[PDB]
Amino acid sequence: SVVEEHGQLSISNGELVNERGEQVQLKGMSSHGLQWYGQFVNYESMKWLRDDWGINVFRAAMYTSSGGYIDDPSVKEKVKEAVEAAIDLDIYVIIDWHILSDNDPNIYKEEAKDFFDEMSELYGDYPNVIYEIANEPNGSDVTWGNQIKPYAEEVIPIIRNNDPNNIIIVGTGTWSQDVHHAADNQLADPNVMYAFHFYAGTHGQNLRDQVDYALDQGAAIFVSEWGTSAATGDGGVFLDEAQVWIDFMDERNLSWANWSLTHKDESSAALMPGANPTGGWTEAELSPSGTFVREKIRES
Ligand SMILES: O=[N+]([O-])c1ccc(O[C@@H]2O[C@H](CO)[C@@H](O[C@@H]3O[C@H](CO)[C@@H](O)[C@H](O)[C@H]3O)[C@H](O)[C@H]2F)c([N+](=O)[O-])c1
Numbered sequence: 001s002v003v004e005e006h007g008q009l010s011i012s013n014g015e016l017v018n019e020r021g022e023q024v025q026l027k028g029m030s031s032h033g034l035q036w037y038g039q040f041v042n043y044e045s046m047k048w049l050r051d052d053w054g055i056n057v058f059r060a061a062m063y064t065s066s067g068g069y070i071d072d073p074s075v076k077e078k079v080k081e082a083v084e085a086a087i088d089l090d091i092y093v094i095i096d097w098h099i100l101s102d103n104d105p106n107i108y109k110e111e112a113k114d115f116f117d118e119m120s121e122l123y124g125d126y127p128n129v130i131y132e133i134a135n136e137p138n139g140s141d142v143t144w145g146n147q148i149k150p151y152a153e154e155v156i157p158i159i160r161n162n163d164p165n166n167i168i169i170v171g172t173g174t175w176s177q178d179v180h181h182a183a184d185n186q187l188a189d190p191n192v193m194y195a196f197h198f199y200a201g202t203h204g205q206n207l208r209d210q211v212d213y214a215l216d217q218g219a220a221i222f223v224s225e226w227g228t229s230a231a232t233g234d235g236g237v238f239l240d241e242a243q244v245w246i247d248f249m250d251e252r253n254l255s256w257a258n259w260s261l262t263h264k265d266e267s268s269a270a271l272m273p274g275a276n277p278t279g280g281w282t283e284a285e286l287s288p289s290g291t292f293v294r295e296k297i298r299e300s
Helices: 002-006 034-040 043-053 075-089 109-123 144-162 179-183 205-216 239-251 288-299
Strands: 010-012 015-017 027-031 057-063 092-098 129-132 168-170 192-199 221-227 256-261
Touching (some): 027 043, 027 092, 034 057, 034 075, 034 256, 043 075, 043 288, 057 075, 057 221, 075 092, 075 109, 109 129, 109 144, 179 192, 192 205, 205 239
Parallel strands (some): 027 256, 092 129, 168 192
Antiparallel strands (some): 010 015
């Protein structure tokens, strides 16, 4: 129903819109690393998330390093499984080239170009797909102008040769927080968005003001990863600040994906240790984070 109703997504005046030009807001879940917690990514779990939580997007977090794609490229097949499930379930799907320790997206740019050629060839004639080409650039030596924008200007053409206008999300500096610099030096492609990531353990008032600065430059922002936890993914749950961010995102029409769908013993994890990887979770099988996130998406 979601994809049939909204169809082809695009950016209009800095806003995500559907094929009739109306604003749309995606809310859903990210997987954790597919090399670690891929068992939670399947048609049945995604269907449960769609039906019981109300998700309209799912993010497939394919780590590149940390035992991910570069080390063992078999994980690309799990991305394909996720994309195919999203197609079958009529929801949107984010294909996330999940850089992190490999902090400069240029390190594996050749592999990224090949991977996005393949994905865009396979899936470029579906409206479901959103390409996220570099999760979290980070480090003081990785800047928008010198590293990230030129990387994007190599990968985006590869995608566009196969898929002229599905959305592309481009990471920003400082773990996808530095939307200020990106917004001042935007990419040419009209269907690009910049990633902004937050963690509710961080006091967020200035970060909200920076997102607003970026929006005021006409940049589109997708909050492709956020957590209820500290920036490590752990250390407590911070629901008061999470709610402030939830309300902010609704006011600004910002789409989002929560980190993450796993049973790992960390505060950002949505599931408790015994949760079935194919869905059907009772209240006792959701963590405090998962319970909150499910409520937010159901309310929506
Ligand atoms: O300082 N920050 O702003 C900041 C922000 C985001 C961020 O990292 C980002 O946000 C979460 C929480 O840190 C990471 O997930 C965590 O990845 C760890 C390393 O794979 C895992 O062990 C852990 O289970 C998992 O929850 C994501 O991969 C990454 F995109 C990191 N980081 O991972 O260091 C730092």
